[PDB]
Structure formats: C-alpha cells, structure tokens
Amino acid sequence: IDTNILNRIVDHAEVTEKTGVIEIGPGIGALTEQLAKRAKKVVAFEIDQRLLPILKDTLSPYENVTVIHQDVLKADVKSVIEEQFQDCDEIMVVANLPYYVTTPIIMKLLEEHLPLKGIVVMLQKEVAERMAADPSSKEYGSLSIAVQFYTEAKTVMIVPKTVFVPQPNVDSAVIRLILRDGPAVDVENESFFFQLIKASFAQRRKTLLNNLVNNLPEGKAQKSTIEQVLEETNIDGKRRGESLSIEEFAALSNGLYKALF
Amino acid sequence: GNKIHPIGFRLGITRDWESRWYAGKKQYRHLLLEDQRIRGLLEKELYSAGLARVDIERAADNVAVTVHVAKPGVVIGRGGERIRVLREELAKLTGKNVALNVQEVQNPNLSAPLVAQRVAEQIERRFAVRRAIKQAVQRVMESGAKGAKVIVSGRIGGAEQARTEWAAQGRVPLHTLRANIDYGFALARTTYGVLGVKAYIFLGEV
Amino acid sequence: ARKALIEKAKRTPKFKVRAYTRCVRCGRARSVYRFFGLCRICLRELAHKGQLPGVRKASW
RNA sequence: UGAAACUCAAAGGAAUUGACGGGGGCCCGCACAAGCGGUGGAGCAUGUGGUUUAAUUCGAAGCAACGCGAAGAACCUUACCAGGCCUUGACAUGCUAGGGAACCCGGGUGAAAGCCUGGGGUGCCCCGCGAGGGGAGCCCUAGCACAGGUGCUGCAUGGCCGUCGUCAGCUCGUGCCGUGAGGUGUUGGGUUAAGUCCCGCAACGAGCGCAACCCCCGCCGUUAGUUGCCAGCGGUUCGGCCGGGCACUCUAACGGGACUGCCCGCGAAAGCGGGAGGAAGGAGGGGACGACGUCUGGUCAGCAUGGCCCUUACGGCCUGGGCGACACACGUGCUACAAUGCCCACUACAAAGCGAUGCCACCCGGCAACGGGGAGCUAAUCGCAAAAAGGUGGGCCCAGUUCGGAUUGGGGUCUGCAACCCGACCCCAUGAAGCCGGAAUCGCUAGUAAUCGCGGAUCAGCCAUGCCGCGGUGAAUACG
RNA sequence: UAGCGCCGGCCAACUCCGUGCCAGCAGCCGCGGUAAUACGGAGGGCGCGAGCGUUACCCGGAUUCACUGGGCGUAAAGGG
Ligand SMILES: [Zn+2]
C-alpha cells in the first residue's frame, strides 16, 4: 500500500513548481504522479519494456514528463541534465531502487560530480545505517565513508515492513542526502585513499595495523613505514578502525602519500 | 435496442452545432466539403494534443477555426512555431486566411470524447477492459458529473466471440431532453480487429 | 466504390450525359443528394454529429 | 429366514433459482366479434422463384425477404458477357540511370480505348566570365518499395438497422427474514395507457424504463406591418389597382391557458358518476422518443476492419450486348367490369412545396406533343398552377355498350453523341379479357376508413401505376 | 562418496521446449486435440538424506458398530 507515504517522501525531498527531479525505475509511476502534480518538468529512466505501456497511460494527462529508454549506469547523465533541465534551478533525485542495483546506482551518480542539489531515495533499512553512521556504531564501513565524503547524508524516514501490498522481507528507510559543495577532506591520492578505507575494513575484528599491513601488495615491503606513519599521525594502528573518522583517515592518507606517492 | 445519437437528438436545445455558418443552395456543398477537409486535417494532426472538438465559423470569405484541446502546450510549442505552421497549412488548404484559435478544456475528465479516446488507447495498450471501464467511470464521477457510462463494443482480448462489456454509475437519463448529456465515440484499432468505445456523461440538467 | 470508379467520375467523360454524381465522403453512386453531395448514410451520420448547420430532426 | 463373488463413486432427503407442461387463474392489443372497403377472378406495372442464355452481376428468405438495397439500368451507372488494348498502372508517398524538363499542335491506325509518330518547343532560379550552366520549377522513360481488388468468410468484428415491442418490464443500496443457496422490496385488493397511483404489508428508497421536459395542430394576448391584409374614408380604367390605414385575416417571436383547478353526490384513499365555467375536461389530437436483453437476426456490395487469396489480371481503360429473356408459379399495386354512372361545355373553393445550365407569363404557327419571338422573377412580389371530385346545362338509355382501353398498324414531337434490343409524350385507325371474382385472406375505432386531386427527392429524359408529404368531400359499427 | 522422491488441489516446491485424447500420468478429483505449472526432457525449487521411494498387512483419521460416543415421519431403519 502506497497512498500517503509517497506524499511524505516528496514533502521531505522539498520539491516545488520550479524544481526539476530525476526518477529511476518508475514502474507504474506511483511517485511520478505526485512529482508531476507538485514539481516542474520531470525525467524517467525506465528500462522495462513490459511496464512501458502502463507508465505511458499513467502519465498521459501530464505534459511535464520525459521518458528515457536508457539504463542509468550506462547513460552519461551530464548530457541528460544539460538537455532536459535547461531552465530549472535545482535538480533533485527521487527513486525506489531495486535492492541489487542500489549501491552501484548511488556510487555512479556521486562519482560523476553532477550539479544535483541532492538525492532522496527509498531503500532497505539494512543498508541505511551503513551509509549514515558515526565512530563505533557497528555499521561503520567503506560505504559510509564514500557517502559521507561525497555528500552530507542522514536517514529521514523509517517505512516499516508492514506497508507494502506483498509483504516484503526487510524494513525500509528513506534517506535524504544533501550534496556537499566541496569534499570534506582534501586527498591528492583519492583512489588509494578509497583502497585504504576498504583495507581498514576488510575484517572488522582485527586491529588497524594488521588490517593495513595485510591488505596491500606492498604491505609486506612497507611494514615499518606503515607502523611509523600510524605512530606519528597520533592515530595509532593499535585500534580497530571503526573508532576512527574522516579526519584521522585524511591525516593518515596524507602521511602515506606525501612520503610514498 | 437501436438507441439514437444523443447529440442529434438534442441539437435544437441544450446542444449547439459544431459548424456555425450560412450558405445558399449554390455554395452549401462546397463549403461543407472544405469544412470536412479541415476537420479531417485537424483530426489527423492534433491527435496527441488531446483534441475534443472542432468549431468552424464563417462571416465573409473568412474562417474562424476553434480547437478544444486538453493540453494546448502541445499545440503551440516554442514561440508558437507549430500553431503558425498549422495556420499556414490550413490556409494553403483553402485560400480564406483561416483564423485558428485554441481553447483548453477545464477538467478533461468531463469531456466524453476524451474519455472514450483514453479508454480506446488503454485497449490498444492491451489493458484489461473491465478494470479500465470501471476506473474511467469512477474517474469521471469524481469530477462532479452527476452520471457516467462507458461501453466497449466487442472482440475482447482476442477472444473468438465478441461481447459487450458495459458499465454505468449515477443518472444517465437518455430519454429526457433537458439532460445535457455529453457523448463521445472512439475507435480502437487492435491486432485482432476493431473495438468501439462509447462514453456518456450526464453533466447537470437543463 | 472502387478507387478507379471514384477517380473516373471526376473528369469530363467525352459527353455531358455520361457524367454522374457520387458521395464526396464514401464514393457511393446510388442515393446522393445534390444539396449536400452526400449519400443518405453520410447525410444521417453528419446530421447526427451536429456538423450540418441548421439541420435538425423534424417532427410536425 | 437370507448371503457372496463382482461392479460404480456415487445412490439419496428437503428446499432455492430458472426452463417446461396435450396444468390453472386474471389482464391486454382491429386478435376475434359488430361494421366498411378490398386481395384471391381479368388486363397491365413491378419484385421474385424457376427456366433460358455468352451473360441474364449480386445480396434480402415466415411474421421480421418478395413497388426490398435501387430517392430514376438506352451509353455512363455496372460490379456480368463477347471482343480491342495497358501493365509503378485510373489513384497516393517515395527511391534510384541519363534523355529534360513544363505547354501548345498536327496525321496514320479506328468501333472507341490504345499504339506509331511529325511539328512551334513554355522558360528561367542563380543571371560566376554569363554560353553552357552545375539548380530547386515542372515533364516524360526505364529499373523497385508500392497501387489496386463490388475477390471469400456478417459464423473473427466496428458502426448502423430490423424484431419481440412503446410491450412494461430489468435491477441496485441499506435494513429485515433464513444455517445456507436465496427471499423481501417487485407478493395481495383496487385502479390505470403504464412497476401509473392508493391501501395493506419488514421494508424504505434509488437507477435504467412509463410519464413529463421538445415539436406540430386547436383559443387569446402582446411586439412587427412588406412582397401579406382591406372594416371606415378620399380617389377610382372596376383591379386592393391609387392615396391611405394596418383595424381584420396572415406571417414569425415571446407568453398566457387545462392542473380533477371549482361546486354536487360517493369511496378509507387512488379515484368514479353528473354540473358550471371554458376554444379545449380528465392522456385534448398527432410526432420525435424504442429498458436489461432475444434472435450465431441484416449488411465485408455505403464506410471502416482482423484473417485468407489474385497481383500481364480475380487490377485498369474502350465498343457492343445483358441486368428488359419466358412453357410457367407466387407477392405488392394501378385501371375496370358501369347509371350513386360515362362523355362534353361553363363556373367555383385548398394546402404544402419548387425554381436562375432554372420557373418560364403573353403572342404567333400546328388539332396537338411542341416550335419561334418574348417579358417577369435568386422569390409573402414573378412563375410552376389547370386543383379534381363538386355545382350548373346538354348528351347517352342497359347494349360487352358514348362501359373498359389491352394489343397492333400508321404519322409526329422532345431529351440525348446516340430512343433497334430498351424512353416518354401527341394524333388517326384498331377496340381485346373483363357482367363484382371458389377455398382462403388483408386494412381500419374519426377528420379515421373510402374516394378526389396537388407537390417533392432522385433526374438530360424516363419506363413513378412506386416512395415521402399536402390538402378537398367525408360513412358504418363496436352488445361482448 | 551424494543420492532419492516430489513441484494442478489435497501438500512444502514454476518456467521453457517436445507431443496434440497420441505417447502417456493417476491415491482421489481427474489431466492429455497446438499457449499442458497434471505426460516426456531441461533449468530452477522443495522434503529427507546413507539413504529415499514403491507394494503388502495392522491401528488412526472412521462419532463409519457410536460403553465413553449414532440413529429409525419423508435420507437406509418401527415388527400387519
Ligand atoms: Zn456517403
């Protein structure tokens, strides 16, 4: 059942008669109807051939709707924005993502540096604290780092399991990401920074030093280097890694790359 | 059975002619023929726009075409390019410098032709007929409309045998003159033949 | 109402008394009316549509 | 008294909704009855079945096909047949090779279509130096996606129509009754054109239907007075013709009026029987208006349309024929069989329509159909237009006849390129069957039946005695 | 070393080809003639697992011999 939940999602996304929105996986167009009613020109990236007639029929009485037959991942959305939202001020993203391609979608959208105002999505609670957490939260990880680096994010709505027509298996949480003008911390070696983040969380039980040394091809070579760098940066490798933050990671990354990159 | 056209029944009272012009016996047929040509052209052209009605008027070698459309945005476009070229085309059809006008219908749920067209589109999109009719009737009834009724002809869902579906709600008094009943017919061309969608909307009295 | 026959009655048939009239809407040659140029069926259809000005159902 | 072996997945009881009955009750409709005209008998017109033919193109099949599709078949229509001919084609949007651009025009062929051709070329748009010049502008001529099909299925369909039937029915919401399917309402009494109303009653309402809302006619107001009208007056060629008025009729807009509204009796009420008043009295007369549905109802030949099929022929032009045959048989009509009549002269009284490739006043020629001249009318003005039955006067005198007008011979007019198959009309001869029609059977309840004319659509003309309308005179009967 | 049965309702487990009242399946109800979740095979799923199914016999479900715990107006059953 989706009667008022959609309205609340749109309210939290804060759309108006001048804001542009992006829809992924519209299906029937439950959210699309409300978005057309409230917002300015919309856009959709449906890929399912079977549901296309139903979406067309749903959006027949609307004139501010554009439908695209491209996959979000494959399509370069920069041209999409420059073509469609040619007059609009703020371009937001609202969608219900289908479980599997939910993290890839977010990552692809964020890694392309869009002029998007922000994002409001509906996904599972499972991976919801995993992308909005804090030091020693038991949900801290690589996903959390990526999301809380690229943008500013916090969970907004907790849609319980007992709302849908066919009872799903997982509770859902609508999350709102306000995009950040400039990256939180400055890293020259961004790629190896990300690999460092994933290395510190390869196994969440081991200590940070052991994580860092055991996850690099050069880890064996630069054991002493790793140890000295973690010691000097006032954030030692004797901790687990879940107790660190963006700032400690930035300092450590600087320590590694200023000296070995 | 064999009901008569609800519009032709009420032409004098509670309805008005789509064509409003006078001509002697000499020139009646020519004017009517060019009128039919104009109607055909506009039916072909402005389909996607949500056309409901075409009105034609004549004063003195002058034509005043008026088109009722759900979405005039489609008709006009950017800087009135489409409307301008459409005026050019119509004038090229008949050397009388036609003065095209476009009106937006308030609440396109209250236009029988539009409802019939939408249901026909749904049928052509291989929708379930019964659900479509029920939803259409409910949609019309939500927008005032003291009565509504929708009929689909036959040959439902590629079945060998044809059958009428039928669904009404409220008052549809086809026998009373002061009824102001709006009527709309649409033909749905499907891979398994043709379907006829009729819509009656009882919108007030007198 | 073969397309050939319709396209043939639109010329000068070498004589005046060879020409005839057809319904301008459906090409019927049977029961057309001079005033309208329509067959009986097209006349009824267009009269019901309300597309014929001042043409109404009679009852005296 | 009383088994079994073998077989079936049922066999049964009560009740519900329908369908049916050589069950019943009540009610209705020209259904019958009481009347008035017919049909079936004769001639002819027309539509069919058969038969014939090269073809006699097809579809319609009790009511509900059969003067039906067809509100116009000599060519055309035309879809059929015999011949002469064309194959991006009568018709559309394109693709690709140069002739090459458009248009005008003349001969052979000839039944016409088509073919072969010979000429003035109808060229600029850029105006590169302007003389070839590449271009849009048209046009042919081949190569190809495509045309096209009245070719088949109405038993794949849409739309539209017929029919039961303008019959009075078909259902739903909430409530209540039942374990439940379901019932109630919607049954009962009365009344009505009607499920139209009243009463009774666990039902109370509603929707689609009935009714009313719309149109015409019947009475009267206002607004308006020309092309319509003329009471009073003044002219007057006697003509509403003139000046006048617009009173009256009328024309066309808007309203009024009729609702058992008012008295008398009766009934619980719906309502019933009388009575004023009123133009109209209880639905005032007529029309439009056709429920859920039934009929594998009708139409692929009005149109659209899914499937199948043909695409040097199942497509397309042209000439001629055919749809008009004829040992027969059915349906719908027209004229008659006579004296309440038939013929001939004079004189009257309508309505609704139609007309500028038309209506055609008047005059002249012909006995006429018509022809020549010729006005007036895009229309309350001009014309079609003679209304006929009727009323007067004269004739006929019961005879297959001054009845009836088929058939045939001979002249002639008009339309049309053409009138033989196969048009209409005028004139002179010819003068048939028919003396009121067996069994059976049709229509009609009032301005109706019967009878008499007039107009219109289609249409060059007409095989229209058909269809749709308009007025004149105007019966009988209905106990049940 | 991983097999065995089932996937129309009972009853947990769904699609694609093959076939066209044939080959077959079947404990009951039944499924098979052109779009088969019911036959054959594949992919996938479900149950159990050194086991999994089938046949035979006994008790249950069977208040279906009713002591617990049934009935006999019309269903079988009141004696003439
Ligand atoms: Zn027609």
Tab-separated table of N, CA and C (backbone and C1' of nucleotides) in Angstrom, chain D residues 425-456:
chain	number	residue	atom	x	y	z
D	425	C	P	-46.085	8.155	-71.529
D	425	C	O5'	-46.586	9.444	-72.319
D	425	C	C5'	-46.502	10.753	-71.730
D	425	C	C4'	-46.433	11.812	-72.803
D	425	C	C3'	-47.496	11.735	-73.885
D	425	C	O3'	-48.745	12.270	-73.470
D	425	C	C1'	-45.396	12.121	-74.888
D	426	C	P	-50.096	11.738	-74.141
D	426	C	O5'	-50.140	12.509	-75.535
D	426	C	C5'	-50.263	13.941	-75.587
D	426	C	C4'	-50.325	14.415	-77.019
D	426	C	C3'	-51.342	13.722	-77.913
D	426	C	O3'	-52.651	14.262	-77.770
D	426	C	C1'	-49.267	13.848	-79.036
D	427	C	P	-53.939	13.338	-78.039
D	427	C	O5'	-53.917	13.128	-79.619
D	427	C	C5'	-54.074	14.244	-80.516
D	427	C	C4'	-53.956	13.801	-81.955
D	427	C	C3'	-54.813	12.616	-82.369
D	427	C	O3'	-56.171	12.969	-82.600
D	427	C	C1'	-52.639	12.362	-83.261
D	428	C	P	-57.313	11.848	-82.500
D	428	C	O5'	-57.103	10.994	-83.828
D	428	C	C5'	-57.283	11.580	-85.133
D	428	C	C4'	-57.158	10.527	-86.206
D	428	C	C3'	-57.895	9.226	-85.934
D	428	C	O3'	-59.281	9.321	-86.234
D	428	C	C1'	-55.708	8.743	-86.696
D	429	A	P	-60.291	8.218	-85.665
D	429	A	O5'	-60.028	6.973	-86.622
D	429	A	C5'	-60.191	5.640	-86.125
D	429	A	C4'	-59.498	4.648	-87.020
D	429	A	C3'	-59.514	3.219	-86.492
D	429	A	O3'	-60.715	2.550	-86.846
D	429	A	C1'	-57.299	3.809	-87.023
D	430	U	P	-61.674	1.977	-85.700
D	430	U	O5'	-60.989	0.591	-85.323
D	430	U	C5'	-60.415	-0.253	-86.338
D	430	U	C4'	-59.361	-1.141	-85.732
D	430	U	C3'	-59.755	-1.825	-84.433
D	430	U	O3'	-60.538	-2.980	-84.696
D	430	U	C1'	-57.575	-0.923	-84.233
D	431	G	P	-62.100	-2.990	-84.336
D	431	G	O5'	-62.137	-3.265	-82.748
D	431	G	C5'	-61.205	-4.221	-82.178
D	431	G	C4'	-61.067	-3.974	-80.694
D	431	G	C3'	-62.370	-3.939	-79.880
D	431	G	O3'	-62.208	-4.622	-78.643
D	431	G	C1'	-61.175	-1.950	-79.538
D	432	A	P	-63.460	-5.330	-77.944
D	432	A	O5'	-62.818	-6.655	-77.338
D	432	A	C5'	-62.420	-7.740	-78.198
D	432	A	C4'	-61.085	-8.296	-77.767
D	432	A	C3'	-61.045	-8.918	-76.375
D	432	A	O3'	-61.523	-10.258	-76.398
D	432	A	C1'	-59.210	-7.454	-76.631
D	433	A	P	-62.896	-10.632	-75.656
D	433	A	O5'	-62.424	-10.945	-74.167
D	433	A	C5'	-61.554	-12.057	-73.887
D	433	A	C4'	-60.887	-11.877	-72.546
D	433	A	C3'	-61.821	-11.636	-71.364
D	433	A	O3'	-62.360	-12.838	-70.830
D	433	A	C1'	-60.054	-10.069	-71.300
D	434	G	P	-63.894	-12.887	-70.370
D	434	G	O5'	-64.048	-11.644	-69.345
D	434	G	C5'	-63.429	-11.725	-68.036
D	434	G	C4'	-63.375	-10.350	-67.416
D	434	G	C3'	-64.718	-9.763	-66.973
D	434	G	O3'	-65.107	-10.230	-65.687
D	434	G	C1'	-63.488	-8.134	-68.187
D	435	C	P	-66.341	-11.244	-65.536
D	435	C	O5'	-67.449	-10.363	-64.804
D	435	C	C5'	-68.028	-9.220	-65.461
D	435	C	C4'	-69.374	-8.861	-64.870
D	435	C	C3'	-70.291	-10.017	-64.476
D	435	C	O3'	-71.069	-9.634	-63.344
D	435	C	C1'	-71.343	-8.717	-66.141
D	436	C	P	-71.151	-10.573	-62.048
D	436	C	O5'	-70.017	-9.966	-61.109
D	436	C	C5'	-68.810	-10.695	-60.820
D	436	C	C4'	-68.101	-10.091	-59.626
D	436	C	C3'	-68.902	-9.996	-58.329
D	436	C	O3'	-68.040	-10.227	-57.221
D	436	C	C1'	-68.216	-7.839	-58.986
D	437	G	P	-68.427	-11.306	-56.112
D	437	G	O5'	-67.349	-12.484	-56.333
D	437	G	C5'	-67.522	-13.420	-57.428
D	437	G	C4'	-66.167	-13.920	-57.861
D	437	G	C3'	-65.112	-14.031	-56.752
D	437	G	O3'	-65.145	-15.313	-56.138
D	437	G	C1'	-64.243	-12.757	-58.554
D	438	G	P	-65.812	-15.498	-54.696
D	438	G	O5'	-65.547	-17.052	-54.354
D	438	G	C5'	-66.566	-18.031	-54.679
D	438	G	C4'	-66.013	-19.424	-54.505
D	438	G	C3'	-65.171	-19.669	-53.248
D	438	G	O3'	-65.996	-20.020	-52.142
D	438	G	C1'	-64.054	-20.541	-55.170
D	439	A	P	-65.647	-19.483	-50.673
D	439	A	O5'	-64.433	-20.418	-50.232
D	439	A	C5'	-64.651	-21.775	-49.795
D	439	A	C4'	-63.335	-22.474	-49.548
D	439	A	C3'	-62.380	-21.772	-48.586
D	439	A	O3'	-62.668	-22.073	-47.226
D	439	A	C1'	-61.211	-22.344	-50.553
D	440	A	P	-62.947	-20.884	-46.184
D	440	A	O5'	-61.563	-20.095	-46.150
D	440	A	C5'	-60.354	-20.732	-45.691
D	440	A	C4'	-59.145	-20.116	-46.349
D	440	A	C3'	-58.716	-18.754	-45.812
D	440	A	O3'	-57.927	-18.869	-44.632
D	440	A	C1'	-58.777	-18.674	-48.171
D	441	U	P	-58.110	-17.815	-43.429
D	441	U	O5'	-57.553	-16.455	-44.045
D	441	U	C5'	-56.158	-16.294	-44.362
D	441	U	C4'	-55.953	-15.067	-45.215
D	441	U	C3'	-56.231	-13.736	-44.534
D	441	U	O3'	-55.114	-13.284	-43.777
D	441	U	C1'	-57.325	-13.787	-46.629
D	442	C	P	-55.333	-12.328	-42.502
D	442	C	O5'	-55.167	-10.867	-43.118
D	442	C	C5'	-53.931	-10.465	-43.737
D	442	C	C4'	-54.099	-9.151	-44.461
D	442	C	C3'	-54.533	-7.971	-43.608
D	442	C	O3'	-53.434	-7.379	-42.928
D	442	C	C1'	-55.833	-8.040	-45.586
D	443	G	P	-53.647	-6.736	-41.474
D	443	G	O5'	-54.252	-5.272	-41.774
D	443	G	C5'	-53.512	-4.378	-42.641
D	443	G	C4'	-54.344	-3.153	-42.930
D	443	G	C3'	-55.109	-2.560	-41.744
D	443	G	O3'	-54.292	-1.710	-40.951
D	443	G	C1'	-56.558	-2.759	-43.606
D	444	C	P	-54.524	-1.642	-39.370
D	444	C	O5'	-55.726	-0.607	-39.226
D	444	C	C5'	-55.655	0.703	-39.819
D	444	C	C4'	-57.034	1.301	-39.940
D	444	C	C3'	-57.863	1.305	-38.667
D	444	C	O3'	-57.516	2.398	-37.826
D	444	C	C1'	-59.178	0.497	-40.463
D	445	U	P	-57.565	2.231	-36.228
D	445	U	O5'	-59.104	2.458	-35.892
D	445	U	C5'	-59.799	3.599	-36.432
D	445	U	C4'	-60.843	4.111	-35.469
D	445	U	C3'	-60.376	4.418	-34.047
D	445	U	O3'	-61.002	5.621	-33.606
D	445	U	C1'	-62.188	2.910	-33.984
D	446	A	P	-60.155	6.767	-32.863
D	446	A	O5'	-59.771	7.774	-34.038
D	446	A	C5'	-60.443	7.725	-35.309
D	446	A	C4'	-60.638	9.109	-35.886
D	446	A	C3'	-61.110	10.198	-34.924
D	446	A	O3'	-60.686	11.431	-35.494
D	446	A	C1'	-62.811	9.760	-36.503
D	447	G	P	-60.439	12.726	-34.589
D	447	G	O5'	-60.405	13.933	-35.662
D	447	G	C5'	-59.430	13.904	-36.738
D	447	G	C4'	-60.019	13.221	-37.952
D	447	G	C3'	-59.240	13.368	-39.267
D	447	G	O3'	-59.301	12.146	-39.994
D	447	G	C1'	-61.428	14.120	-39.579
D	448	U	P	-58.262	11.849	-41.179
D	448	U	O5'	-58.108	10.266	-41.122
D	448	U	C5'	-57.371	9.634	-40.062
D	448	U	C4'	-57.975	8.290	-39.742
D	448	U	C3'	-58.431	7.469	-40.937
D	448	U	O3'	-57.349	6.716	-41.472
D	448	U	C1'	-60.145	7.509	-39.304
D	449	A	P	-57.199	6.518	-43.055
D	449	A	O5'	-58.400	5.534	-43.415
D	449	A	C5'	-58.296	4.121	-43.153
D	449	A	C4'	-59.606	3.433	-43.444
D	449	A	C3'	-60.068	3.465	-44.896
D	449	A	O3'	-59.455	2.426	-45.652
D	449	A	C1'	-61.877	4.021	-43.470
D	450	A	P	-59.008	2.684	-47.172
D	450	A	O5'	-60.343	3.216	-47.861
D	450	A	C5'	-61.368	2.300	-48.284
D	450	A	C4'	-62.497	3.041	-48.955
D	450	A	C3'	-62.090	3.946	-50.112
D	450	A	O3'	-61.989	3.228	-51.338
D	450	A	C1'	-63.488	5.147	-48.635
D	451	U	P	-60.872	3.632	-52.418
D	451	U	O5'	-61.383	5.040	-52.963
D	451	U	C5'	-62.585	5.138	-53.748
D	451	U	C4'	-63.032	6.576	-53.872
D	451	U	C3'	-62.046	7.528	-54.528
D	451	U	O3'	-62.108	7.475	-55.947
D	451	U	C1'	-62.837	8.490	-52.522
D	452	C	P	-60.838	7.914	-56.822
D	452	C	O5'	-60.771	9.492	-56.601
D	452	C	C5'	-61.791	10.353	-57.142
D	452	C	C4'	-61.434	11.803	-56.932
D	452	C	C3'	-60.038	12.211	-57.372
D	452	C	O3'	-59.969	12.439	-58.773
D	452	C	C1'	-60.502	13.132	-55.241
D	453	G	P	-58.628	12.095	-59.570
D	453	G	O5'	-58.167	13.516	-60.173
D	453	G	C5'	-56.800	13.947	-59.973
D	453	G	C4'	-56.800	15.215	-59.156
D	453	G	C3'	-55.423	15.800	-58.836
D	453	G	O3'	-54.957	16.609	-59.909
D	453	G	C1'	-56.731	15.711	-56.858
D	454	C	P	-53.442	16.475	-60.410
D	454	C	O5'	-52.635	17.360	-59.360
D	454	C	C5'	-53.041	18.711	-59.069
D	454	C	C4'	-52.258	19.260	-57.902
D	454	C	C3'	-50.775	18.927	-57.886
D	454	C	O3'	-49.989	19.750	-58.735
D	454	C	C1'	-51.679	18.516	-55.748
D	455	G	P	-48.633	19.166	-59.346
D	455	G	O5'	-47.577	19.269	-58.133
D	455	G	C5'	-47.311	20.567	-57.547
D	455	G	C4'	-46.483	20.394	-56.298
D	455	G	C3'	-45.145	19.670	-56.468
D	455	G	O3'	-44.130	20.548	-56.935
D	455	G	C1'	-46.291	18.813	-54.576
D	456	G	P	-42.920	19.972	-57.805
D	456	G	O5'	-41.969	19.249	-56.723
D	456	G	C5'	-41.420	20.035	-55.636
D	456	G	C4'	-40.802	19.126	-54.601
D	456	G	C3'	-39.707	18.178	-55.097
D	456	G	O3'	-38.455	18.852	-55.152
D	456	G	C1'	-41.242	16.991	-53.721
